[PDB]
């Protein structure tokens, strides 16, 4: 068992390093490009910031995990980290959702809109997404305590609360984002197909990756969590093999999930020719 935890620790260290470097570079280039006459996008900067915060919080999780699931730090760290991580993760997911619809609208609706109006719209959307992410994340930390750091929900209906929270994490966390992103990237692909000039410059094998990496990142984790919750409901028989399999699956898929943090810079900005040229210039 300790072998698995050590392997996951190594993977986490690698992910932390890569994500930190990539997000820092992206943010720096985004800040500096505005002096060269470019028009950088607010969503990319906010997404980079959110990924940077999650990566910064990873080390606390690694330290807690290596310590045989013990929690040496106090309750203050419990609350602060479980709040920061959740807020940043939800913000990143919501920005990935909003970015697809913005990209699609850029080719049809915003073709003849002055830059000032679209800039104002983008700022409003960014503020709204940040506020919504914080509001959705707050309840989880609202009832988090340590004594083993975990959540102690109200007893009278404790059962419901569990599933309650889970539903949100699958309804507003992965279901709707995937639905919207897939639908709007398919529509964008169709719109590019309709035109002829755009075909030569752009490539249709990048949008498919955009819409598939989300699944590759967040489907195993959610299915594992749903299996765990169903097990906690005693629907599945209680067995040592089953509990061990669930534990291993949850840990490995959690480790895989954070790859979502370090794969955004490589997928949304690095492959962009203009960004690469600007980076080489800088």
């Amino acid at each position, epitope marked *: 068992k300790s072998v698995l935890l050590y392997t996951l620790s190594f993977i986490y260290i690698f992910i932390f390093v890569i994500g930190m470097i990539a997000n820092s570079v992206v943010v720096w280039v985004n800040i500096q490009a*505005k002096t*060269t006459g470019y*028009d950088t996008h607010c969503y990319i900067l906010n997404l980079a910031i959110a990924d940077l915060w999650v990566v910064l919080t990873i080390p606390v999780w690694v330290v807690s995990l290596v310590q045989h699931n013990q929690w040496p730090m106090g309750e203050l760290t419990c609350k602060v980290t479980h709040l920061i991580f959740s807020i940043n993760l939800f913000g990143s997911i919501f920005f990935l959702t909003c970015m697809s619809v913005d990209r699609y609208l850029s080719i049809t609706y915003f*073709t003849n809109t002055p*830059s000032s109006r679209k800039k104002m719209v983008r700022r409003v959307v960014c503020i709204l997404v940040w506020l919504l992410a914080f509001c959705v994340s707050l309840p989880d930390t609202y009832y988090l305590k340590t004594v083993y750091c975990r959540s102690f929900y109200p007893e009278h209906s404790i059962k419901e609360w569990l599933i309650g929270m889970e539903l949100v994490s699958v309804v507003l966390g992965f279901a709707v984002p995937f639905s919207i992103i897939a639908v709007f990237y398919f529509l964008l692909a169709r719109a*590019i197909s309709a*035109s*002829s000039d755009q075909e030569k*410059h752009s490539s249709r094998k990048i949008i498919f990756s955009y819409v598939v990496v989300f699944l590759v990142c967040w489907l195993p984790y959610h299915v594992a969590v749903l299996l765990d919750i169903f097990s906690i409901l005693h629907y599945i028989p209680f067995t040592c093999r089953l509990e061990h399999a669930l534990f291993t699956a949850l840990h490995v898929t959690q480790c895989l999930s954070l790859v979502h943090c370090c794969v955004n810079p490589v997928l949304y900005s690095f492959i962009n020719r203009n960004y690469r040229y600007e980076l080489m210039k800088a």
Partner: antibody
Framework: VQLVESGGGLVQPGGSLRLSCAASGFNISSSSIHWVRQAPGKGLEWVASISPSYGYTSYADSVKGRFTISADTSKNTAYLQMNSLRAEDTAVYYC????????????????????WGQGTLVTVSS | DIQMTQSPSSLSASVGDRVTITCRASQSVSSAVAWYQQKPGKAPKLLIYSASSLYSGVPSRFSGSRSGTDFTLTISSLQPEDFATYYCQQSYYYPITFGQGTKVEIKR
């Protein structure tokens, strides 16, 4: 990109006209179409602009409420209809394309008109 | 409407001399400017788009810059084919407003 205008010709004051800019070599719906006007021996001026996809049109002050700009994607064409023309509208009209590129959505630049058609004199003389 | 002043109104420089044309806005426009070139009785061409980018096709002589709300077009060597009015456009705020233009003419 081979934008070409049409129409134009002597018109009695207060009449009406419909200029047509018919594009080619690309789909009109992925770029906005503007109309620029040049008075005889003077600087350029802006008139109207249209996005063929959902039709969000913005007009200039001197033509507000008089000039209507429409688009037809079934033929890659834009039409500017003008009415109640005054003596001050004598000019030459070009149609320009504000090129938009998707392959640089993340890190773009403030685009500008790049492909202009030829003139079409509009002599509003009684 | 955003008023865009342009100077000098009329230039006079012999072949090979440098040239500099300045465009002053009214409010702040963030790099949303362009410079064209209208030959006598011909459709204007796009020389510079955005703050300083060069439209693919123009010679490297033409270049642009930015300073707050003041933009400038600089030409190193004034070739004989570069004598024609140059206009200044801003795209940030509609309606789009052009400049007066700065006719460049032979010297003797």
């Amino acid at each position: 990109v081979q934008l070409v205008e049409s129409g134009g010709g002597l018109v009695q004051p207060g009449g009406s006209l419909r200029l047509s800019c018919a594009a080619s070599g690309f789909n009109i719906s992925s770029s906005s179409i503007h109309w620029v006007r040049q008075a005889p021996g003077k600087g350029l001026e802006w008139v109207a602009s249209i996005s063929p996809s959902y039709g969000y049109t913005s007009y200039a002050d001197s033509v507000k409420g008089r000039f209507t700009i429409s688009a037809d994607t079934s033929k890659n064409t834009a039409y500017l209809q003008m009415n109640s023309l005054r003596a001050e509208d004598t000019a030459v009209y070009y149609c320009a394309r504000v090129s938009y590129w998707d392959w640089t959505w993340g890190w773009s630049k403030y685009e500008g008109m790049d492909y202009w058609g030829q003139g079409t004199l509009v002599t509003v003389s009684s | 409407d955003i008023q865009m002043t342009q100077s000098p109104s009329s230039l006079s420089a012999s072949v090979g001399d440098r040239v500099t044309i300045t465009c002053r806005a009214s409010q702040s426009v963030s790099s949303a400017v362009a410079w064209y070139q209208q030959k006598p009785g011909k459709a204007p061409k796009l020389l510079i788009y955005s703050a300083s980018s060069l439209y693919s096709g123009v010679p490297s002589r033409f270049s642009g810059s930015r300073s707050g709300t003041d933009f400038t077009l600089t030409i190193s060597s004034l070739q004989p084919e570069d004598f024609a009015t140059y206009y200044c456009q801003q795209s940030y705020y509609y309606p789009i407003t052009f400049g007066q233009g700065t006719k460049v003419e032979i010297k003797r």
